[PDB]
């Protein structure tokens, strides 16, 4: 698949299909993934990046390439890899969608607040692009949500879902290891036919990444 990088190599986008790309940024080294959705009404991101500098660079790269503005971002939980660029979003007039709990936790941790507009299931449409957000329960954090693209059967698992390269659950200080398996099971029950799964860190995979996360929780 096509992969495009910035002048420094700290930001990369990789095409999943005509209108869906994965963005990956390196924070001081630790890579993090989100999505870029190229819609008829603008670019929509799933997740920002580790900090304002990387978020600015990401936005500038995709706006130049796709020749449209970033209008919205979905924030999937309140840690820095997801929300670290919220100041940039708000000052540029980019809408930052989140659940109410993710917004409360952002404020509690001293970040600017996202909108708090997403419910347990929310269905959004941006141009012709359909996006569903789902809160499956506690796991990696208390507020983690997943994002589903029903027109492609692509699931953005975020940090709820570990990549194949992950050999342990990572930092579990904010995690609920006795609920995380049930939360993964709720994803598997809701989305019974999955084409690709994008983890918060590491390589894109399929439903097997959810099964891998279940095994790491044993
Ligand atoms: O492993 C991950 O996907 C992430 S986002 C870990 C993390 C980033 S700040 C932080 C603070 C407390 C516990 C975990 C973490
Ligand atoms: Zn996290
Ligand atoms: Zn993460």
From Swiss-Prot:
Record-linked Pfam families: Lactamase_B
Family: Belongs to the metallo-beta-lactamase superfamily. Class-B beta-lactamase family.
Protein name: Metallo-beta-lactamase type 2
Cellular compartment(s): Periplasm
GO molecular function: beta-lactamase activity; zinc ion binding
Native source species: Bacillus cereus
Keyword Chaperone: no
Cofactor(s) needed: Zn(2+)
PROSITE patterns: BETA_LACTAMASE_B_1, BETA_LACTAMASE_B_2
GO terms under cellular component: periplasmic space
Note describing how the cofactor binds: Binds 2 Zn(2+) ions per subunit. The enzyme can also function with only 1 Zn(2+) ion.
Chain residues that bind Zn(2+) 1: 77, 79, 140
SMART domains recorded: Lactamase_B
